[PDB]
Amino acid sequence: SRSVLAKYEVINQVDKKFILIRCSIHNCPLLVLVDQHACDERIRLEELFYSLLTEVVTGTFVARDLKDCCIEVDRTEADLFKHYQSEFKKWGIGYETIETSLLEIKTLPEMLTSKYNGDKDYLKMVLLQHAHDLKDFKKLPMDLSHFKLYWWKYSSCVPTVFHEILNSKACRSAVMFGDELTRQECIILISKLSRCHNPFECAHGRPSMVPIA
Amino acid sequence: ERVNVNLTSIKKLREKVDDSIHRELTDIFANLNYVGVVDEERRLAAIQHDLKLFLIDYGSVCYELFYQIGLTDFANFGKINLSDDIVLYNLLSEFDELNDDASKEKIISKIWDMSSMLNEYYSIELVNDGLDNDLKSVKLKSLPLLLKGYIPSLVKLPFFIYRLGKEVDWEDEQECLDGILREIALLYIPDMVPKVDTSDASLSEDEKAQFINRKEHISSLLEHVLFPCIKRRFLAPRHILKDVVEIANLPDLYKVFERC
Numbered sequence: 001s002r003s004v005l006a007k008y009e010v011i012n013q014v015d016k017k018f019i020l021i022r023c024s025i026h027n028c029p030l031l032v033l034v035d036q037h038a039c040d041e042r043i044r045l046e047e048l049f050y051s052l053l054t055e056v057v058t059g060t061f062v063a064r065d066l067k068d069c070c071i072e073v074d075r076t077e078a079d080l081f082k083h084y085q086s087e088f089k090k091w092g093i094g095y096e097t098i099e100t101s102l103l104e105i106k107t108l109p110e111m112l113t114s115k116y117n118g119d120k121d122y123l124k125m126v127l128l129q130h131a132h133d134l135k136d137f138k139k140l141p142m143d144l145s146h147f148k149l150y151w152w153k154y155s156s157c158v159p160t161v162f163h164e165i166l167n168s169k170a171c172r173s174a175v176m177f178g179d180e181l182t183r184q185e186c187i188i189l190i191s192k193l194s195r196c197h198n199p200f201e202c203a204h205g206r207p208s209m210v211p212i213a
Numbered sequence: 214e215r216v217n218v219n220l221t222s223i224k225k226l227r228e229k230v231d232d233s234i235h236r237e238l239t240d241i242f243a244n245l246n247y248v249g250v251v252d253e254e255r256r257l258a259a260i261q262h263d264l265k266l267f268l269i270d271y272g273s274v275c276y277e278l279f280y281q282i283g284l285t286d287f288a289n290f291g292k293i294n295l296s297d298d299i300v301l302y303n304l305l306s307e308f309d310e311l312n313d314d315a316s317k318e319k320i321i322s323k324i325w326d327m328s329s330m331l332n333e334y335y336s337i338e339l340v341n342d343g344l345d346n347d348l349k350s351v352k353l354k355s356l357p358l359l360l361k362g363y364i365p366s367l368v369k370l371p372f373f374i375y376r377l378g379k380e381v382d383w384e385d386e387q388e389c390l391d392g393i394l395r396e397i398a399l400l401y402i403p404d405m406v407p408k409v410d411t412s413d414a415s416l417s418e419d420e421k422a423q424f425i426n427r428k429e430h431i432s433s434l435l436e437h438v439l440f441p442c443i444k445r446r447f448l449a450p451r452h453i454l455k456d457v458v459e460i461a462n463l464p465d466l467y468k469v470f471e472r473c
């Protein structure tokens with residue numbers, strides 16, 4: 001299924017947009033144009049998801065101390081945060097519920113600190129978004145009673161705010177259309193792309209390659 | 214100094230070639246952007262014309278190119294000199310089909326009888342060392358130079374000498390001169406590289422390394438010596454329409470993925 005890509009040889013870059021690749025023993029496999037941006041975005045994303053999940057699982061995830069951040073919440077909203085407090089700690093979001101009630105956010109992870117940027121209204125929405133996600137069984141809690149590491153086993157448990165943050169970081173750092181890639185740079189891209197968990201889609205879910213044969 | 218060709222056959226061979234030319238196919242070659250080798254065995258490469266990706270049989274294009282160059286540059290060819298000597302008598306040993314010695318000597322006899330013509334019209338110098346009637350001591354001094362920087366692979370050389378006496382009919386001017394140009398081009402076309410199973414353990418490290426070397430040499434010849442020449446002087450005849458296939462229309466691929 002994925003082992004088909006491992007049997008692909010790089011030809012060269014096409015229109016500074018694609019990387020043309022070529023495949024005896026042809027059981028559903030001859031020519032495929034790999035989207036260079038989607039290829040780099042994919043490799044880059046899986047590196048970012050590995051970095052985040054290895055950090056979170058080993059308790060090495062950075063949680064920068066936030067000062068004077070109190071957010072007004074509903075009685076049920078306050079109860080929803082009192083419930084999943086332990087869950088938000090796993091992501092570096094350390095807060096205390098006051099008592100109408102108020103959410104006293106003590107700490108935040110370095111990426112969320114950056115994206116929030118003093119917008120209490122944005123931050124409230126993002127935590128509520130995950131609290132509701134957990135509550136309505138849309139997202140599972142992070143089980144850390146497992147004591148190598150496979151980031152994709154825990155990928156589904158990453159809050160949407162982080163997911164969004166990692167997708168944009170991947171896309172931004174990635175190679176763009178109209179960029180010059182040497183045959184060697186392409187060999188390397190496709191070499192790493194074939195070592196991905198999901199090499200057939202990009203960070204934003206779009207297909208990373210279209211066979212032409 | 215360029216030599217005058219007052220031969221009726223050469224002017225008739227040029228008219229046939231000029232009429233065969235297809236403008237739409239030649240417009241694809243004139244503006245080609247060579248991507249790379251797709252199949253070393255079937256002799257397939259990929260080029261990009263405008264926003265379209267094409268699949269080219271380079272063996273066919275090379276056949277027609279080296280046939281065209283020969284017709285244009287008739288009796289105005291260079292010379293390729295050969296410590297390591299190659300004998301025509303020992304070159305034909307590859308064929309076990311010609312079990313008889315007098316049958317093997319019959320081929321050499323047709324070439325030496327035409328040695329003066331071959332060196333003056335096609336720059337194929339053939340010099341004997343022994344007796345005037347002796348056929349065992351007959352070598353090949355020089356081969357014509359069609360493209361500067363391109364040295365033809367001598368793997369197909371025993372077939373070239375075999376087919377020059379056997380296939381080429383020396384009993385008609387136009388058919389004989391056409392036959393020799395068709396034989397030189399076959400020798401001049403880059404060799405096929407048959408596929409070998411790299412993942413199979415039953416093959417030695419040398420077999421696997423040499424196959425890679427053959428693959429890398431073919432791509433170098435195509436990118437640096439062969440395809441620039443094709444983009445420059447190649448005139449595509451109508452029968453090559455079958456050997457130039459569209460595989461992708463690139464604006465149809467921009468639709469699948471837009472700027473993130």
Ligand SMILES: [Zn+2]
Nearest residue numbers: 202203204473
């Ligand atoms: Zn994307």
